[PDB]
Amino acid sequence: DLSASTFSPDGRVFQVEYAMKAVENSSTAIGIRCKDGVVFGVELFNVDRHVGMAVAGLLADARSLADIAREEASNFRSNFGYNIPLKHLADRVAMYVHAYTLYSAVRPFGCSFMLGSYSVNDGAQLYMIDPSGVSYGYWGCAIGKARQAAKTEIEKLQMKEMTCRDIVKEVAKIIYIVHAFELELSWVGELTNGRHEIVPKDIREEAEK
Amino acid sequence: DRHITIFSPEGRLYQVEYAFKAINQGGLTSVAVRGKDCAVIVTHLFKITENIGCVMTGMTADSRSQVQRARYEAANWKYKYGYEIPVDMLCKRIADISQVYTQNAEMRPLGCCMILIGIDGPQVYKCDPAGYYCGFKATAAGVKQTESTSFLEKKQTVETAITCLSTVLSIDFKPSEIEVGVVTVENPKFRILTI
Amino acid sequence: YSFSLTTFSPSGKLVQIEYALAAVAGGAPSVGIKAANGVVLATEKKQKSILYDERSVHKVEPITKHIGLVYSGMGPDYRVLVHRARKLAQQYYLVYQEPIPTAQLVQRVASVMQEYTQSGGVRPFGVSLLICGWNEGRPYLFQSDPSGAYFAWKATAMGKNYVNGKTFLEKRYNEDLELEDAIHTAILTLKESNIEVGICNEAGFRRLTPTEVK
Amino acid sequence: YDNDVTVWSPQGRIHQIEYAMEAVKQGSATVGLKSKTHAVLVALKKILHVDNHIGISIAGLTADARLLCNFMRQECLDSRFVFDRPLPVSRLVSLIGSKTQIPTQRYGRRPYGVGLLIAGYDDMGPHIFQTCPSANYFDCRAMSIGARSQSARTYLERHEFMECNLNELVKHGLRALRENVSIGIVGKDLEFTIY
Amino acid sequence: NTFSPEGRLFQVEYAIEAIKLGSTAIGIQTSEGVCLAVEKRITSPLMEPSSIEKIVEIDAHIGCAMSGLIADAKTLIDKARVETQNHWFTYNETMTVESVTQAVSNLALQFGSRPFGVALLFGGVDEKGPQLFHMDPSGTFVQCDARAIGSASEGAQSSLQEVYHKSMTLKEAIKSSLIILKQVMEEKLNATNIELATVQPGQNFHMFTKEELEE
Amino acid sequence: SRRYDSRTTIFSPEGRLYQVEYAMEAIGHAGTCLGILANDGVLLAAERRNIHKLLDKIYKLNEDMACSVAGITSDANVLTNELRLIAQRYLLQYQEPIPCEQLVTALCDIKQAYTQFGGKRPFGVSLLYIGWDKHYGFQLYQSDPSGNYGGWKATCIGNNSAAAVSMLKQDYKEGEMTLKSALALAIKVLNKTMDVSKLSAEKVEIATLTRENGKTVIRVLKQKEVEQLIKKHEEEE
Amino acid sequence: TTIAGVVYKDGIVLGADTRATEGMVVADKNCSKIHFISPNIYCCGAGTAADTDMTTQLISSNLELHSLSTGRLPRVVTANRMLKQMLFRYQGYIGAALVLGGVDVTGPHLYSIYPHGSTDKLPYVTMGSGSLAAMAVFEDKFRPDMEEEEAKNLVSEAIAAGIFNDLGSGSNIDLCVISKNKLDFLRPYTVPYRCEKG
Amino acid sequence: TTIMAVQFDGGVVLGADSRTTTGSYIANRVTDKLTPIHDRIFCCRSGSAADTQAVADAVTYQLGFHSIELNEPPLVHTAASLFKEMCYRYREDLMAGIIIAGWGQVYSVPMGGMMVRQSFAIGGSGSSYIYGYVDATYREGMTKEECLQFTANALALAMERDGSSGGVIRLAAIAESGVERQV
Amino acid sequence: NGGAVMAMKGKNCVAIAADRRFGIQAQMVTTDFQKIFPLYIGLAGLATDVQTVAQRLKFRLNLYELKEGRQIKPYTLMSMVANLLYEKRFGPYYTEPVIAGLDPKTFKPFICSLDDFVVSGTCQMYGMCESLWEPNMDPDHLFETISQAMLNAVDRDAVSGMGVIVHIIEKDKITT
Amino acid sequence: PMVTGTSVLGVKFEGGVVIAADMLGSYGSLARFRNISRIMRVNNSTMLGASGDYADFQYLKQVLGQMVIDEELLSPRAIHSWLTRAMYSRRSKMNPLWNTMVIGGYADGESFLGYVDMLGVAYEAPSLATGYGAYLAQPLLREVLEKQPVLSQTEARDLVERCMRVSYNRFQIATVTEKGVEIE
Description:
The structure is cut from a larger assembly and holds ten protein chains of ten kinds.
Chain E: H1 10-19, E1 25-29, E2 34-39, E3 55-57, E4 62-67, H2 70-91, H3 97-106, E5 119-124, E6 132-135, E7 141-143, E8 146-149, H4 153-163, H5 170-184, E9 194-199, E10 206-207, H6 210-213
Antiparallel strand pairs in E: 1-2, 1-8, 2-9, 3-4, 4-5, 5-6, 6-7, 9-10
Helix pairs in contact in E: 2-3, 4-5
Chain G: E1 3-8, E2 11-17, E3 20-22, E4 25-28, E5 34-36, E6 42-46, H1 49-70, H2 76-89, E7 97-104, E8 107-114, E9 118-121, E10 124-127, H3 131-141, H4 152-165, E11 173-178, E12 186-190
Antiparallel strand pairs in G: 1-2, 1-10, 2-11, 3-4, 5-6, 6-7, 7-8, 8-9, 11-12
Chain I: E1 4-9, E2 14-19, E3 22-24, E4 27-30, E5 36-37, E6 40-45, H1 47-67, H2 74-86, E7 95-100, E8 102-103, E9 108-109, E10 112-113, E11 120-121, H3 126-129, H4 139-156, E12 164-169
Antiparallel strand pairs in I: 1-2, 1-11, 2-12, 3-4, 5-6, 6-7, 7-10, 8-9
Helix pairs in contact in I: 1-2
InterPro entries (chain F): Ntn_hydrolases_N, Proteasome_alpha, Proteasome_alpha-type, Proteasome_asu_N, Proteasome_bsu_CS, Proteasome_sua/b
Main location (chain F): cytoplasm
Subcellular location (chain F): Cytoplasm; Nucleus
């Protein structure tokens, strides 16, 4: 109820939810799976060269999960050779996120973060990881403060055939409507060749414009 | 008291039943039917081994830990013995480690019912966060689990399961809502049916 | 944790163990009789939903060539306790090379159940179990309980309504009785309070064969 | 009741981290500004030589400041030895976030309640980095920590400091501090030194 | 472990309260020499008048007075001696008082089990000449000129405030402790009611004989 | 986490540990037992916990030493196990049978460690040691359920230890006992402690430790002899 | 030290000789080598008798624990796989080698298992000091399609080839049939002045 | 020994002989050295059989545990990378000349342990005799049928000189939708 | 070093015998050195191992003999030392134990050795006794055959001899 | 040491660093791998070639790629510096690497060409040639240096193109260029 190992009678551990509330406070990140690529935007971490991450929830803790994800990508590249697939990366990092929930001593994470990756076989993949260790694929994700409030405009978008090229502006646009706003945007799509990278500054300035 | 796994004055673990109530509040309603020749499961489908699958039911996060543990043990079986772990042996072992959560007050029961299906003929094992496992003939676990069990007791296999979920959750489904997994005598390969 | 959840009450009672004895009070009835051909152990199990299986998890699990167990209490706890009991028996066989004396396996397993009444972060085992064995010239019928106290018996009962089951066992039976005849008192003491049964004799430990249970 | 480090507030966040912020306030003020020529620590006597071109200014409890600092020195030598170059400042600050991280995530382990201003000379042009009692750290044009910093911050919206060089910076750093002066200067011409 | 809602730790502030039931101790620094001084802290008469001790050597150049929890002090003291000799073994120079005090501060709040209650007064005449580092149990060392540690010490602090002198002479600085210790003490100070130890710029640290103390 | 821990090593503001006091009281629930030294041997009577019909405490620490276990059964077995180990390790390297006084100090060190540290429950079981160490001849020791031990000429432990031991205060004359007087006093006090006027053979069992012809032997009495002592009791009444 | 096995139609006739030598002296003219791992499966041993006996006891306790647990009599391949690992891990410190034979519903399997851990099922296998001499006879004479009783006439002569020709191996042949039909142990099987008191 | 791996078309065609001699005395002529470590990826081995039993199976363990999670047939170079790891970490307590193929992608592992992608390879102490026959035949423009006769005839010439190899020539054909293992 | 260990089983009486000497190199140390430790056991080989195994075995055996007043079976004792010595297969103690003595209450002899009669030790014995063994001897005879085999094998042998001890185990009497 | 390639050369061109190496990975007298490319391309420019047991090259190729890949998402001199740490650490356990590698990288108008010996000896040198050219190629490198104290784009280029003719002729000619990272 206040200690993580204990269950409240009804059917949940309230500690995990209190840790969940932390990301319900912090401002909206919004990634968008797209015909190619996932434009992360957050009004970014190079998890790997392959993989980008957009954190939400308290930043302190978020960096440790970023570093663990960098470690996870590297161990996979060494042991297996080939660049890690996101469908496995999400599940691994999410597993590590999950372990905390299970034992009294370590606290649940505050963060929730959408890692994404464009890759040839998979195509774009945009997985968000909750502090419970529940990861799902998305077509769009937006988490934070304006949580459903952003979701109504990414619902308004219909990426399935929107190009990444519209979306690099649209993420910033959704950010502006739910939102002064410091803007950040990322492109991971095949033009960027799966190199996780910040939007080129002229388009980013145009996007805020 | 009701916080650290210890016995109540009624000789009853509180945290364990809280975990059962957590399974019910996972909001999913799994059912499996053991036909003679096939072993339908329906709901979170998993492939613990190429010949074995199971559906966890409860807390979503919690499912994945025991999925990975099931794959760990299932793989380690073949590593030390060299044949598919029987469904009974796998359910037994996962139950044996779920008891560790209960014996130890440090760590907590993972609330996920584990309906294994696979041919050792076809098997439909249940596992609880209690550490109790038993072979049923037509299990169900979840929210409307009791309302389904009656309809199971009253009782083509795929039909039994699908009409059971339809009648019992009292809803007409879309195919995406009902994920279905079959393990036919000729197909010991765990396979999602794909109605 | 590192701190035991067993601590004395003001007059010196192990509260958690007493509550473990309450957990023994639950569970389906068990019964066991030393007759003179061989012991029998038997237990109520139920269809419950009518979708169950009866050969899946017997409460009657052989441990060693001629020992067996029957539990009352929580079923989950039994599955692991049996594992350690088998561990002690096989370990004993590779060191000593004779199937371990009934009295000794009961003692060693009792020590396992005692460890948690002194060991950190763990509760005591809820399961109480008859441990019936036959070596040399004697059938052995034992009762281990949650505190790790154990007693050999001539006849004994466990689970729900053991309180009356033991009463029947001391008046409806005494001395000796040919093994099915001492099963007579089993089937009729169990009746006071589906069913699994297993017998010992000297014919390798045995589950009373299902056609003949009928 | 959130008197443990692990515990999260139903209301919100871990309270020990928030109480660690207030631990900063009993320590004396320190001001960090910079120009392209030299980084400027000014501390109301606390400045330390972390590295030949990096220096921290403590605020809050001294104990955690020394513990973090004893680590800082060894970490500066790590990059200087393994790769044969000066440690870039930003990486060392990233290590501060990693070492401060462990208490917040764990039990029985209190947070590093020192707030630090890690000024350094850097190859991207000098940088200063406040590190809060949580892992989180901030790149910033100018910053102040310790007692009564809010008056010192107020002075800086109107402030010129990226243009005017080290003498005039410090002349104004003293003016900011008025809102017993140790001074810590590093720049492209000169190694970190405690004026 | 718990940072109070008012910032600062609990056990430390309680350890600071433990000092108040510790002996008064002046830590005079003359620029000639060091003059650590401490009330005998004897109360019982058949308790020995020459076997009770308050101030210990660390090196031949550093003395170390203690206050607060007397038993706890000896752990940090012994470890300080191990540190200084380790410094001698590795670099052949003797360990300066700033680092001798620093090494002990590092160990001060390592409870991840409970904080020490000790206040310490290292006095060591090192190449700089006289140095006198007070050490708080908060893991904070501070260079001093005159700090008096312990229970009636707050009055000894303020008394010191008027009489502290620019420079200072060794013998005159000693007389300051001899007078102030009569004030801070409840009883009339006697040479068996003080244990003084002094280090002249040239000498190695000397526990002061009692006859000299009456004068 | 540790918020649950009730400490169980704590030191109390009344100045007497909690578990130690509770350990003393656990024994009062334990059934009667008594050992009686003589100049030739050492008796140990004990009462079988209930007479219950369909059920078909003293142990062999050595062949020259033996213990009575009073407070509880589950813990007692672990104590006896450790006693047998200490004794047979001492016999392993020193190659002489452990002197009994030592064997008691060893187990009491093990007991004391449970109170002193680790946050684990102490063994609540008072023991007796009957024995004949080489250096002192016959001896009897009692182990409090916290470390202690007291060489005693006669003592009782269990239910009504106080009335029984006090009864032996004046009823055990010093330094006069032939083993015959040990049997007489044993049977007296065990008789007086129970509400049953005399005791049945399913109540007493007596391990007499006797120096058997230059090889000391412990022997539980054979029940026919147990009943001659009881049959003598019926006429002692 | 001539141990052998053959996979005949219904199973495996294991065969063994009753001798163990400490170098050049026979210390045991009635040595038991067809160790019972399990009622279903049996394992002959060769090389150092100590390693073979003890390793077989370890696998026995292991196999009998797994079958005791499932309640289903264990498979041969299982026995072999843990033997493969067990004889690999020491890397030649277990220098005693094993011929395991057993039958599981999957039917007969007979793996010679070299002490570095190679398991190879084959219709005929031999091992021991006598193995070269024995395997030439098993090669020359073994035929697939052999019946049940002729194997008795195929391992007793083959082992006999190791009894006469070799000097490490001798004494009465042991022959132990493995079939689900029946199990057979034939412990001593095939046989090929007074110091006046007072 | 002789391990003779060739690539092409739908998938590798590769082969090995039948003997696993210990010294001059043959132990077995029926040994399958081409044995599976996945449905796609089937290992071939040289060095010793004993070290390769410990390896390969452990790679099967990891690789089949690779496949369940990713739900894709494991990458051949991934398996080969596991062989580089297992061989690399103990090269001194090990001997192994693997030639891992999969589906076709002929990969190799020198005992020292470097995974080096060959396009055709030969392994063993019987292998060397093949060199003059492989190098003068491997040709771009050869159809799938050719490699069967090529590998099967190559090995036999190898075996004639090598007194470690003989037995029956066993060939894998690993390819999309099939593994045609002749002997 | 070493020492010889005669052991022989004719009728319920169970003979065993041993030389009472050990040598530091080729020089005799003592003319009295116990090798047959009381169901008896006679170890020979190194003296260090003779004493080490005797101590370790009596320890493990006494833990059992207190845990059950049930006397040990000879076969289980054989397993006890078998397991005890195989634990060092990386550092094996050099001593050759040959137990000899009755199976409890059935008066049935069980002799065996560990890496009719079982001889072991530094020796001379296996070829000497084998055709002299009679499958039936009264102890009166049994003493005679074992004493001949003992004296003849060992008088010849360089590093053994100089005292003989003979226990012919029987419930009725145990002669020495 | 197991199968070993040799013959790696390096030498600077003003605003570039030619590094050529043949592609043999011989094991014994047999040239088992007449296909190995030993010139890893580390960074947009810098690169290592390796001449020594190839297993060690695989280890350090994947490990040096680990250090660069890490740092990128968090200079040749630095890579050589660490490389000396790696070669040294393995020597300290007496479990060395047998690799001997040249690290040519154009860093800020400077062509660093480190050389890291297997037993951890380390220096920069303008005209490096590892084994079999560490007695043969080396005078041919110097003879040009004895006369002209620096080498131009074309000078070091032709020097290596001939010196490699002075193994088998299948060598790849990697060329750092003001940009960096070429291979021919």
